[PDB]
Amino acid sequence: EVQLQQSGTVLARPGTSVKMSCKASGYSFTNYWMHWVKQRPGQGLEWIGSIYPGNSDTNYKQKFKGKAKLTAVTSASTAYMEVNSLTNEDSAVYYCTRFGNYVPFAYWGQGTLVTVSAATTTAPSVYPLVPGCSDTSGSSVTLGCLVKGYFPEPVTVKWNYGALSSGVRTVSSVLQSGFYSLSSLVTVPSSTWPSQTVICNVAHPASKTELIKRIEPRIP
Amino acid sequence: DIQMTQTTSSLSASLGDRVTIGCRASQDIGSYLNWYQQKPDGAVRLLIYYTSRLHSGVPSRFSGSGSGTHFSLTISNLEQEDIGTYFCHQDTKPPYTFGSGTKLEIKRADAAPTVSIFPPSSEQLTSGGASVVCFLNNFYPKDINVKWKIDGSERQNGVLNSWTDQDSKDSTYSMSSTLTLTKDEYERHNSYTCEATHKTSTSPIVKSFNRNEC
Numbered sequence: 557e558v559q560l561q562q563s564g565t566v567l568a569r570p571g572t573s574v575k576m577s578c579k580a581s582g583y584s585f586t587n588y589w590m591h592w593v594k595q596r597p598g599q600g601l602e603w604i605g606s607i608y609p610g611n612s613d614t615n616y617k618q619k620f621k622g623k624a625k626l627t628a629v630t631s632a633s634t635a636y637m638e639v640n641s642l643t644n645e646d647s648a649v650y651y652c653t654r655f656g657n658y659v660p661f662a663y664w665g666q667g668t669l670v671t672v673s674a675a676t677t678t679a680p681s682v683y684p685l686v687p688g689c690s691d692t693s694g695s696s697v698t699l700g701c702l703v704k705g706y707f708p709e710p711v712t713v714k715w716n717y718g719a720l721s722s723g724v725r726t727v728s729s730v731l732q733s734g735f736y737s738l739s740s741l742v743t744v745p746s747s748t749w750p751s752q753t754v755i756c757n758v759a760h761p762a763s764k765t766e767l768i769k770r771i772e773p774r775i776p
Numbered sequence: 777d778i779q780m781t782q783t784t785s786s787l788s789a790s791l792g793d794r795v796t797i798g799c800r801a802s803q804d805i806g807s808y809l810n811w812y813q814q815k816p817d818g819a820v821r822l823l824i825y826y827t828s829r830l831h832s833g834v835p836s837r838f839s840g841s842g843s844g845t846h847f848s849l850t851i852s853n854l855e856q857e858d859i860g861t862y863f864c865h866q867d868t869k870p871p872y873t874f875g876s877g878t879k880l881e882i883k884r885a886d887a888a889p890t891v892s893i894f895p896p897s898s899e900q901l902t903s904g905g906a907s908v909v910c911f912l913n914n915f916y917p918k919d920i921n922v923k924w925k926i927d928g929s930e931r932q933n934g935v936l937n938s939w940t941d942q943d944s945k946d947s948t949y950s951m952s953s954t955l956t957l958t959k960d961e962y963e964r965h966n967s968y969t970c971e972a973t974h975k976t977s978t979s980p981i982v983k984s985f986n987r988n989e990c
């Protein structure tokens with residue numbers, strides 16, 4: 557019922573600013589403190605500050621004064637945070653979260669991932685993972701998609717537009733020489749493939765790409 | 777500021793066992809200590825607030841204790857759904873501070889991996905690159921190594937290893953090892969071999985193909 561809907565992933569150059577949003581629904585926006593929290597990879601959670609949309613009173617951790625700016629727009633039931641003078645240390649997932657009443661952070665946004673980089677967006681290359689010609693044998697087959705050379709994070713992978721979820725294994729992304737790669741694999745029965753379309757759907761929000769790769773037997 | 781310190785960064789425990797996750801505050805924070813669970817998809821959920829009070833849909837298996845300086849979240853009998861990272865949070869007054877989280881893994885019966893090897897696709901090859909993939913499926917424990925041999929010789933360079941998160945249903949892991957070469961390099965060799973060493977067997981699980989398709 558209470559929901560906090562945050563804006564999507566952002567890629568920003570060092571020295572610039574980003575403004576992210578957190579749309580609140582299912583409660584009276586002006587009657588609760590909205591807090592913002594920063595999560596850097598392997599570096600815990602850090603409280604940035606809070607705003608009370610009712611009167612737009614703000615609190616900041618000393619560190620973030622002049623660095624993060626919290627605003628609220630009542631007509632839009634939306635809380636904003638603008639982070640300026642961006643550095644590598646600002647690359648993080650930022651959460652908006654509601655405080656109170658008589659409970660702490662009971663409701664959380666899904667997080668907004670910020671990547672600070674001078675590098676441009678690069679869509680992934682997708683290649684099928686198909687058993688070799690001399691592979692023998694089984695009642696189940698393992699198929700996959702190699703997702704290579706993309707930037708920034710994230711990439712999501714699904715199978716048959718989400719209809720295939722059982723036996724799906726998607727490994728964590730890896731950063732190598734400035735670019736990310738990952739792979740997703742699925743094990744399906746021998747009578748579903750090559751019989752049916754097994755497509756991997758690769759989405760890369762930063763490049764606004766939604767890719768498909770058909771998994772088909774090798775050329776004989 | 778009040779420094780929040782979690783006892784350990786990672787914990788492994790069997791289903792049904794009692795699990796405690798500790799948090800320590802650098803000053804006395806009374807009862808103002810909260811526990812959140814973060815799932816692999818990054819979703820955050822309040823479990824315990826004000827030291828010991830359970831929140832929405834939180835199983836009775838959860839309990840909290842606190843002295844004002846030392847705190848713990850306890851799970852009476854570990855369940856499958858309890859996988860995740862657990863963070864403490866003091867909210868006496870601004871600035872609020874958090875512990876750095878304890879990652880909770882399920883300890884499972886040992887499981888050997890199922891291994892698969894994937895030659896480069898014709899699609900990739902015609903574009904000038906070649907990746908060979910070794911996939912190790914549904915094993916436990918997480919610790920596993922993959923050795924690549926190209927024409928019988930070990931190759932460590934251009935190899936990328938990555939794991940899935942622990943399976944939310946059966947607690948197994950999977951991983952892939954990706955060997956990247958140029959097409960020209962790939963076509964200069966015949967035999968491609970990955971060897972998977974795991975505690976489940978003293979002998980490596982070996983998967984191989986020959987580029988000559990035989």
Ligand SMILES: CO[C@H]1O[C@H](CO[C@H]2O[C@H](CO)[C@@H](O[C@H]3O[C@H](CO)[C@@H](O)[C@@H]3O[C@@H]3O[C@H](CO)[C@@H](O)[C@@H]3O)[C@@H]2O)[C@@H](O)[C@@H]1O
Nearest residue numbers: 587589655656657658659660808809810825826827867868
């Ligand atoms: C039980 O511990 C858990 O609760 C605290 C959070 O509790 C605080 O939440 C709201 C502030 O957001 C605050 O309650 C005030 O807001 C309500 C009005 O909107 C009023 O009920 C109350 O207003 C004032 O606050 C003073 C309370 O001392 C009271 O004198 C005056 O009415 C409540 O303090 C979490 O941190 C713990 O987990």
